[PDB]
């Protein structure tokens, strides 16, 4: 398989987020960060990369 | 690019006549056993429409 997920969180403390993929075996230096829409604010803001959980049992 | 425009050599009465000769041959290669059973009723109607 060789893929991993991660969620993109807002600079604001809304907790809204999107998803994305990257391969596990790469050696990326640059974490992602993008300008996207937080409907809670009705405005674009800078999103940044973060960790995603998993399912336990 | 061998392609060159098509030609209707054969006149129309050939292709009619060619389709007819194509039957007279295949009718000769038949089995006689199939041929009389076909030709036993297939005649009678003609004598019975006439």
């Amino acid at each position: 398989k060789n893929s991993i997920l991660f969620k993109l969180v807002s600079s604001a403390g809304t907790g809204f987020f999107y998803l994305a993929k990257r391969n596990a075996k790469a050696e990326v230096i640059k974490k992602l960060s993008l300008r996207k829409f937080d409907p809670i604010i009705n405005q674009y803001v800078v999103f940044n990369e973060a960790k995603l959980s998993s399912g336990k049992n | 690019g061998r392609a060159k425009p098509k030609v209707n050599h054969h006149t129309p009465f050939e292709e009619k006549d060619y389709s007819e000769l194509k039957i007279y041959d295949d009718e000769r290669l038949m089995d006689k056993q199939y041929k009389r059973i076909r030709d036993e009723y297939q005649k009678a109607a003609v004598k019975k429409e006439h």
């Binding site: - | 060619y18 194509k22 041959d25 290669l29």
Partner: protein, 143 residues
């Protein structure tokens, strides 16, 4: 079948339960010819039996000809698979034991250029008696 990779690939072709075709015969290269007169599965041994007897006609010692006598265009087309003896039906298709040529009705088996009219009529009659097929011989003379 598939002509791409003949030897490499394993080949299968549908038996054609009723296949009939007629192709209007006409001479192109030469004067006289032999032509088939019935749809048929033309084997190879139907040719190799009377292969020498054509060489004795078309080719002779100490005689040189520039142009060409015979034009052949025969190639194999049908694998003709089969099952073993004690095998039930189903469980796949049979395996090979031969190859053949499926020919149409009016097929130029041979095309000749200035070859003895008197021998080919003596040949094709014996040809057709071994094979029990209807075959014909044609020359530009009679036409």
């Amino acid at each position: 079948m598939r002509f791409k990779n003949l030897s490499n690939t394993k080949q299968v072709s549908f038996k054609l339960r009723n296949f009939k075709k007629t192709t209007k015969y006409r001479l192109v290269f030469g004067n006289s010819m032999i032509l088939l007169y019935k749809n048929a599965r033309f084997e190879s041994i139907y040719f190799e039996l009377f292969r020498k007897y054509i060489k004795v006609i078309s080719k002779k010692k100490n005689i040189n000809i520039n142009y060409r006598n015979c034009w052949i265009f025969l190639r194999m087309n049908t694998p003709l698979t089969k099952k073993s003896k004690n095998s039930r039906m189903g469980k796949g298709k049979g395996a090979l034991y031969r190859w053949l040529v499926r020919l149409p009705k009016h097929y130029k088996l041979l095309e000749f250029k200035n070859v003895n009219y008197y021998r080919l009529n003596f040949l094709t009659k014996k040809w057709s008696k071994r094979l029990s097929l209807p075959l014909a011989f044609v020359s530009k003379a009679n036409l």
